[PDB]
Amino acid sequence: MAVNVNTNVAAMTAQRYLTGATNAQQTSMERLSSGFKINSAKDDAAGLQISNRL
Amino acid sequence: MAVNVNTNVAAMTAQRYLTGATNAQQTSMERLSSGFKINSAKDDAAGLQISNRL
Numbered sequence: 001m002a003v004n005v006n007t008n009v010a011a012m013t014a015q016r017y018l019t020g021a022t023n024a025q026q027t028s029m030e031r032l033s034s035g036f037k038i039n040s041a042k043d044d045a046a047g048l049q050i051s052n053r054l
Numbered sequence: 055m056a057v058n059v060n061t062n063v064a065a066m067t068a069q070r071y072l073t074g075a076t077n078a079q080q081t082s083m084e085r086l087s088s089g090f091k092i093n094s095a096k097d098d099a100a101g102l103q104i105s106n107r108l
Binding site: 035 | 058059060
């Protein structure tokens with residue numbers, strides 16, 4: 001990609017990464033607020049099942 | 055184990071040994087009040103039987 005105005009791939013990359021850091025921030029803050037490492041099934045399914053059984 | 059906030063295993067250890075010590079204290083104080091080593095059958099049941107016969 002040469003010099004142009006209609007497109008900006010760097011802007012896409014940056015925001016893609018930013019949103020990645022944002023989801024990381026949100027999950028870390030959720031874990032800190034709840035005090036639990038597995039609050040739902042998407043964290044660890046087997047871990048969630050074994051913790052529920054315990 | 056690492057640093058966490060929801061579970062306090064050391065507190066549970068302390069509570070368990072505290073209740074054990076409290077039960078021992080209550081048993082000793084009951085024995086001192088009654089003047090009898092055997093008050094129920096949970097303390098030397100056969101001893102209770104032979105002492106009752108005596």
